[PDB]
Design a protein around this nucleic acid. Structure first.
Ligand SMILES: O=P(O)(O)O[C@H]1[C@H](OP(=O)(O)O)[C@@H](OP(=O)(O)O)[C@H](OP(=O)(O)O)[C@@H](OP(=O)(O)O)[C@H]1OP(=O)(O)O
Lengths: 494, 512, 13
DNA sequence: AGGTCGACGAATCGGCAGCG
DNA sequence: CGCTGCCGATTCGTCGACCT
């Protein structure tokens, strides 16, 4: 488990603009990531602190710094308390209860922040810091503050704590070269996000930076018996599912441990897996097999990807879907040189418009599967967010048993006039699609219900189901085209 | 679709005799029938098999007279196949020494059909004939047999121990009579109902494919509030699975009823204090918070869907929807509602309009009022004969992830050399799984893996059969023909060689 | 050519 | 160790088909 | 033509094991 700390600017400019103030923008972004962490059931510890504060409060009693939340798991009370500062009314409430726009030293800010990591229990693995401001070179008037802060930041980077800057939109544009460049935790190729002006982009940028990778498995990809490379497998999309209930004791509100025995019907003695056999009845006979035998009969090959050959992409039919795809990337930590082959392969098969085909074996003792590796080129948006990462897409292919035969039916052909009206209808119903457009109604209502109970509010918000069609507007946008199409194609009798 | 089918066996000496280079025609008949019965018994179908012999030393059959229908024995009547019958074929049967008439044996099979199927129901009838055709037979009855075969709807397949393409004059004459009768039933298609035992073994060496009848799902496809189209949908691609599970039994009695499972409850705290099921309640995580919530309240407060739907949210360019996002575990094909001329015209119009504009439809799907709703794409598909929409599920915003992988192209360490790229370029050609310029400028696939049966089921059924026939011996290893079918063509295997040596020589690889 | 004579029969299906 | 992912068995529902 | 039981399919929610 890790830990993360958020830094927020109290400077007067943070409360200035049709666009949201960058302060309220920050608050909304932080709310959305807290909710996001809750919905994942993740175990990381979050914290929120302000700098340049008029009133102040922190462990070491340094001036103009205010810890709002210490380093802990997300909580309902915490998100409610954080939401107390939302919108203009919350901004006014914040500025009334604290004030704003006082002087500070960022050297002390960073020292307080290191104290918060120092105060953590049970040794979290990665320690990171995230900065919100639109002020470039805040100490351009004070080289002594700047140099002691640069010195302190170097010490923290020797301490291995990561730090990074979500620079918000600035009048006259923000410049990275003036300050923070020499201070942030760097990475090898720098290419960096532009300043953020919209909540969607800000959320995308923090969310892309925040999560560390978690390799799903460490396979070997075998070009033949001899030449073999190390690769990581990653899922990139994974089906969200409703968390399971947990059994609870009635009186103490304490969770309970459930176990599962197995014992003889007559004797009642606990039965070892050796005390029983596995059976099936086929035909008119009973067949007896052992647990080790059953495991052994599943054994094919070994875990890993074996190359079968190369196939031109046009042959992979679109409607031969089977299960969600996976993403494959080189893993240099086990086998040196692997990335050079991997990149050479990606380059040449991209130039030749071709997939590879492999026999796949995820884990020990599983029947193989046929998968096709499709090359995928890196693509950045106009915000330099990585939309598609570079690598091979791993597509599963169906066996013969997976196809179901369809019933016979006669072809009947539409007229060009029918198609013409329908094209007009289709164009009149056009819109732009993006994957982030739709939320899951079932999860979205469930968590609303839980929060109303957790907060003792008792009467939950009914979440709008955005998957529903915009019927009245769609009818209005169609006008008389529907009745024209109906009169044209349908006979006078339904 | 029940088929009553009769295996009709020459048990004489001539097929009992073997050319030393090959197993006897009697042995080949044993093997091909063995594959057949293995298929039927491990198939879920309830079709029944009857086995009759002709040329027997004995003479016992429903038609049999003192001199008429001699040397014919009804070894097996019509019941479901079983391991007892299987063992009977495997070891009990032995070669005979007499001869009979196969066109008597098939009218004995007509009598078997008449008297044993009348208490049952069958869509079809088939007779399977095995002989070398070395015996004198009569053709006097040829009209009334062809009439009998026509009127009772009996199909024939003749299996010859030799390729269709040394046979005796009687043999070739019988060949032509086989042609003439199978023409008299089925013409030129009749002349294709002949198979060599070699190709027969090649064809039915594998255990039979699984299949199911996908239930039709009728619905109204809705555009706005006013436009509606009646449709029907079917599952088309699924991760298919054997329904019969393992069963758990006592190691001594082999009975199921001797074993019982118990679920314990105790507090999470030290010394593991036991808890009665009564004082247990249901609750949920919410971060560090734990919320008590009864199942009744959870059900009463759960989101309720309206019920069946297929409603269209709008249309977009096909290029918006990269296929790597495709979600779900099923693929639906959607056809028009059954027997609605207007509906077929409408859906034809939609598939046409969509394919012309190069656009796809976004739809909301719900199986019934109990299931959870989904968001998914539908897109046009066009064939000879029918047209349909395809449908697949799309992701909700909560189910994406992102990972910020390091860009390989701009790296200074991992950029390959031009020589390395040339070795890769040789390799990718050598491993090509497709042939171009078939005079139609079309690809031929040398390894069309959509046609290979799932090997896990092949292994399972093979091991089960081996255990059933032989309890003492351990499990046999996997079959070499199975391995050969799972490997790619040997031509590609041979062409791979030199490029693999080249690439091994060029690229340096070493472990941590 | 749209429907194909290769479809197995009887014993073979 | 702990969590996450996939596979597997059990529950529940609706439709089809056999017998009168 | 109606009743009945059967069957299969289907969707869903727990359980058990491998792997980091
Ligand atoms: O030739 P394709 O364009 O690649 O489509 C083929 C072919 O379609 P046709 O029957 O129209 O010729 C199959 O028949 P064969 O190749 O075996 O001769 C057919 O087989 P199934 O219906 O049994 O699946 C199946 O049609 P579709 O693409 O609509 O699924 C599909 O088979 P493949 O996907 O394996 O290529």
């Amino acid at each position: 488990r890790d830990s993360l700390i958020f830094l927020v600017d109290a400077s007067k400019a943070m409360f200035e603009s049709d666009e949201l103030t960058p302060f309220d923008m920050s608050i909304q972004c932080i709310q959305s990531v807290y909710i996001s962490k809750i919905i994942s059931s993740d175990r990381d510890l979050l914290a929120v602190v302000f700098y340049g504060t008029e009133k102040d409060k922190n462990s070491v009693n340094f001036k103009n710094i205010y810890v709002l939340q210490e380093l802990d798991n997300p909580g309902a009370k915490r998100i409610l308390e954080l939401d107390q500062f939302k919108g203009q009314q919350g901004q006014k409430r914040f500025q009334d209860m604290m004030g704003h726009g006082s002087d500070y030293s960022l050297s002390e800010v960073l020292w307080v922040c290191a104290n918060l990591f120092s105060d953590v229990q049970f040794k979290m693995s990665h320690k990171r810091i995230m900065l919100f401001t639109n002020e470039d070179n805040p100490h351009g008037n004070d080289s002594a503050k700047a140099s002691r802060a640069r010195t302190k930041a170097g010490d923290l980077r020797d301490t291995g704590i990561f730090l990074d800057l979500m620079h918000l939109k600035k009048p006259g544009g923000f410049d990275i070269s003036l300050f923070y460049r020499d201070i942030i935790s760097i990475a090898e190729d720098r290419v960096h996000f532009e300043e953020s002006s919209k909540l969607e982009d800000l959320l995308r940028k923090v969310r892309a930076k925040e999560t560390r990778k978690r390799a799903l498995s460490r396979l070997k990809l075998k070009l033949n018996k001899d030449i073999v490379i190390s690769v990581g497998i990653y899922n990139l999309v994974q089906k969200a599912l409703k968390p399971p209930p947990i059994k609870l004791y009635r009186e103490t509100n304490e969770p309970v441990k459930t176990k599962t025995r197995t014992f003889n019907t007559s004797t009642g003695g606990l039965l070892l897996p050796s005390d029983t056999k596995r059976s099936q009845i086929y035909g008119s006979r009973q067949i007896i097999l052992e647990k080790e035998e059953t495991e052994e009969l599943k054994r094919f090959d070994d875990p890993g990807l074996m190359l079968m050959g190369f196939k031109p992409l046009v042959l992979l039919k679109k409607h031969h879907y089977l299960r969600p795809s996976l993403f494959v990337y080189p893993e240099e930590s086990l086998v040196i040189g692997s990335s050079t082959l991997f990149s050479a392969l990606l380059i040449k098969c991209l130039e030749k418009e071709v997939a590879a085909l492999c026999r796949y074996t995820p884990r020990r003792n599983i029947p193989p599967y046929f998968v096709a590796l499709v090359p995928q080129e890196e693509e950045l948006d106009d915000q330099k967010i990585q939309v598609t990462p570079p690598g091979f897409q791993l597509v599963f292919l169906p066996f013969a048993d997976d196809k179901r035969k369809m019933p016979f039916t006669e072809k009947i052909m539409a007229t060009p006039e029918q198609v013409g009206k329908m094209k007009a209808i289709v164009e009149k119903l056009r819109f732009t699609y993006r994957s982030d457009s739709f939320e899951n109604p079932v999860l979205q209502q469930h968590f609303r219900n839980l929060e109303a109970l957790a907060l003792d509010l008792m009467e939950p918000e009914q979440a709008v189901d955005l998957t529903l069609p915009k019927v009245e507007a769609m009818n209005k946008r169609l006008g008389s085209l529907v009745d024209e199409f109906k009169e044209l194609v349908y006979p006078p009798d339904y | 679709n029940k088929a009553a089918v009769v295996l009709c066996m020459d048990v004489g000496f001539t097929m009992s005799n073997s050319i030393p280079g090959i197993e006897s025609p009697f042995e080949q008949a044993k093997k091909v029938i063995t594959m057949f019965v293995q298929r039927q018994v491990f198939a879920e179908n309830k079709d029944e098999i009857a086995l009759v012999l002709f040329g027997t030393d004995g003479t016992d059959n429903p038609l049999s007279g003192g001199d008429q229908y001699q040397n014919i024995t009804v070894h097996r009547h019509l019941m479901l196949p079983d391991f007892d019958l299987l063992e009977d074929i495997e070891s009990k049967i032995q070669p005979g020494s007499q001869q009979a008439d196969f066109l008597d044996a098939l009218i004995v099979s007509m009598d078997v059909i008449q008297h044993e199927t009348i208490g049952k129901k069958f869509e079809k009838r088939h007779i399977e004939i095995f002989t070398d055709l070395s015996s004198r037979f009569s053709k006097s009855q040829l009209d009334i047999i062809i009439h009998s075969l026509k009127k009772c709807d009996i199909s024939l397949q003749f299996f010859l121990p030799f390729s269709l393409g040394g046979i005796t004059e009687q043999q070739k004459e019988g060949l032509e009579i086989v042609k003439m009768v199978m023409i008299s039933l089925e013409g030129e298609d009749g002349l294709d109902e002949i198979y060599s035992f070699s190709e027969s073994l090649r064809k039915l060496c594998v255990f039979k494919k699984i299949e199911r009848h996908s239930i039709h799902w009728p619905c109204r496809l809705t555009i706005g509030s006013n436009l509606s189209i009646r449709i029907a949908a079917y599952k088309s691609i699924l991760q298919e699975r054997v329904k019969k599970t393992w069963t758990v039994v006592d190691a001594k009695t082999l009975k199921k009823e001797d074993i019982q499972k118990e679920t314990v409850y105790c507090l999470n705290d030290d010394d593991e204090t036991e808890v009665l099921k009564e004082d247990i309640i249901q609750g949920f995580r919410y971060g560090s918070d734990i919320v008590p919530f009864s199942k009744v309240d959870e059900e009463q407060m759960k989101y309720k869907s309206e019920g069946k739907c297929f409603s269209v949210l709008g249309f977009c360019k096909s290029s918006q929807v990269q296929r790597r996002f495709f979600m779900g575990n099923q693929v639906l094909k959607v056809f028009a509602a059954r027997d609605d001329e207007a509906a077929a015209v409408a859906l034809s119009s939609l598939i046409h309009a969509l394919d012309d504009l190069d656009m796809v439809a976004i739809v909301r799907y719900a199986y019934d009022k109990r299931a959870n709703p989904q968001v998914g794409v539908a897109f046009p598909h066009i064939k000879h004969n029918y047209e349909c929409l395809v449908y697949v599920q799309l992701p909700f915003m909560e189910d994406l992830r992102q990972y910020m992988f390091s860009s390989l192209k701009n790296s200074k360490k991992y950029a390959p050399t031009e020589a390395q790229l040339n070795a890769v370029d040789a390799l990718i050609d050598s491993m090509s799984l497709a042939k171009k310029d078939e005079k139609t400028d079309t690809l031929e696939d040398l390894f069309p893996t959509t046609k290979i049966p799932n090997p896990r089921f092949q292994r399972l059924f093979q091991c089960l059969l081996h255990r059933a026939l032989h309890p003492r011996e351990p499990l046999p290893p996997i079959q070499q023909h199975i391995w050969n079918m799972l490997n790619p063509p040997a031509e590609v295997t041979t062409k791979s060689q030199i490029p693999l040596s080249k690439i091994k020589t060029l690229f340096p690889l070493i472990e941590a | 050519s749209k429907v194909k004579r290769k479809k197995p029969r009887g014993l073979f299906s």
